[PDB]
Amino acid sequence: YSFKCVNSLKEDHNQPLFGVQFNWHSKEGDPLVFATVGSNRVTLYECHSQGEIRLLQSYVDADADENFYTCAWTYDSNTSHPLLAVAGSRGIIRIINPITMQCIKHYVGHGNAINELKFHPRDPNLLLSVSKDHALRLWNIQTDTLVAIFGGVEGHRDEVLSADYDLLGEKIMSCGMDHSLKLWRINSKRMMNAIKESYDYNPNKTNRPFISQKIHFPDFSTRDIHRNYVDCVRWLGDLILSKSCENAIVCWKPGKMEDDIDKIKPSESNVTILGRFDYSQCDIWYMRFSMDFWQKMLALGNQVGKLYVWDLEVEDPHKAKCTTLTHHKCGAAIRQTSFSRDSSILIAVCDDASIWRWDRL
Numbered sequence: 001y002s003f004k005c006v007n008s009l010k011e012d013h014n015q016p017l018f019g020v021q022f023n024w025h026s027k028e029g030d031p032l033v034f035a036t037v038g039s040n041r042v043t044l045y046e047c048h049s050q051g052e053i054r055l056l057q058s059y060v061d062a063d064a065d066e067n068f069y070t071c072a073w074t075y076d077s078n079t080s081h082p083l084l085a086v087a088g089s090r091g092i093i094r095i096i097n098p099i100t101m102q103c104i105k106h107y108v109g110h111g112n113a114i115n116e117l118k119f120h121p122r123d124p125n126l127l128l129s130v131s132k133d134h135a136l137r138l139w140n141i142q143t144d145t146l147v148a149i150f151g152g153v154e155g156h157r158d159e160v161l162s163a164d165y166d167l168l169g170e171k172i173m174s175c176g177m178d179h180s181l182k183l184w185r186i187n188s189k190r191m192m193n194a195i196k197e198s199y200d201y202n203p204n205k206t207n208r209p210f211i212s213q214k215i216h217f218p219d220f221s222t223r224d225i226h227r228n229y230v231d232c233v234r235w236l237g238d239l240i241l242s243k244s245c246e247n248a249i250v251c252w253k254p255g256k257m258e259d260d261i262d263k264i265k266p267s268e269s270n271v272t273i274l275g276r277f278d279y280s281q282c283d284i285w286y287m288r289f290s291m292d293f294w295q296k297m298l299a300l301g302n303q304v305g306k307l308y309v310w311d312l313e314v315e316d317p318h319k320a321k322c323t324t325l326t327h328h329k330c331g332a333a334i335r336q337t338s339f340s341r342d343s344s345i346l347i348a349v350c351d352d353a354s355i356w357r358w359d360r361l
């Protein structure tokens with residue numbers, strides 16, 4: 001069963017769609033749902049049979065000058081109800097109730113735009129934001145606390161564009177405009193204690209403010225993978241996938257070939273390149289690749305509407321199998337893609353506000 005294009009639509013604001021995410025927490029027996037973000041809007045859609053994309057409801061920011069760049073799903077840890085976090089150029093994180101599209105609460109702190117949001121893979125309350133102000137921030141949305149800020153002179157020296165947690169949420173890799181990729185361990189004694197204290201914090205029961213950690217030294221750093229802005233990074237096991245605007249996703253690891261990622265010291269000067277997935281016409285800034293839930297597949301769109309999909313179910317990264325998907329009516333730049341949890345549907349969103357649905361048939 002290969003992917004076939006079954007439907008498309010266009011949002012009425014005619015501005016770029018910069019983010020799309022399926023809700024991988026959608027419940028058994030419920031339709032698949034994805035969110036899109038662009039302009040000052042967040043919109044939810046349901047996937048139905050015969051390729052139908054059913055429009056539900058939007059959240060529209062009161063600031064006409066807001067531009068949402070990113071969204072991420074989680075759930076309420078006490079009720080299991082789904083939640084959607086969104087953020088963009090205003091640097092405000094909004095937690096949206098996707099049922100009613102009400103803004104439930106918001107967080108301010110970043111000195112500028114937020115370029116990506118990610119939830120911890122094991123803890124639905126821990127939200128990571130990366131910002132134009134050169135820092136990452138880790139929030140606890142259960143107690144509304146800023147747990148840690150990752151920055152300083154040895155942190156990123158320009159806008160941070162992307163970050164990703166590893167499998168267990170023990171470490172973060174970040175990347176951005178300074179061409180660098182940086183590792184931040186969050187399973188240190190200091191960070192585990194900070195997370196524990198954030199859960200114990202209730203401003204109604206104490207006089208102290210909550211103290212955020214300032215983490216000023218990454219556990220690894222390299223500028224030897226890309227030669228331009230690094231705008232997307234993801235873990236693949238202990239390996240890293242990252243891209244710039246140089247028509248390539250590089251698969252690499254810190255240290256030499258046989259170096260364990262958890263033995264890597266901050267002074268480590270070597271990296272190892274395990275493969276590189278080349279493609280065409282994707283040389284503009286701000287284009288994201290995505291993986292499915294099981295990390296069997298990788299997808300990326302290019303600036304003229306072509307989709308590349310790599311099968312990662314092979315013995316080594318450089319053996320990945322590529323397929324391409326095109327439609328004669330899809331010619332705008334694809335900023336982000338999202339697989340449904342089972343990988344039966346792939347959605348792409350574009351600079352002309354169009355949405356493209358591909359079904360595995």
Ligand SMILES: Cc1cc(-c2cnc(NCc3c(F)ccc4c3CCO4)n3cc(C#N)nc23)n(C)n1
Nearest residue numbers: 018019069115116161162231232286287288335336
């Ligand atoms: C034509 C155009 C493009 C953008 C734009 C998009 N996305 C971001 N950040 C989000 C992001 C990212 F960090 C890395 C990869 C990526 C995404 C969205 C799609 O893949 N942007 C940050 C600034 C600034 N300053 N501009 C943008 N605009 C406003 N207009």
Ligand code: NA
Nearest residue numbers: 007008009010
């Ligand atoms: Na249509």
Ligand code: NA
Nearest residue numbers: 203204206207
């Ligand atoms: Na108090």
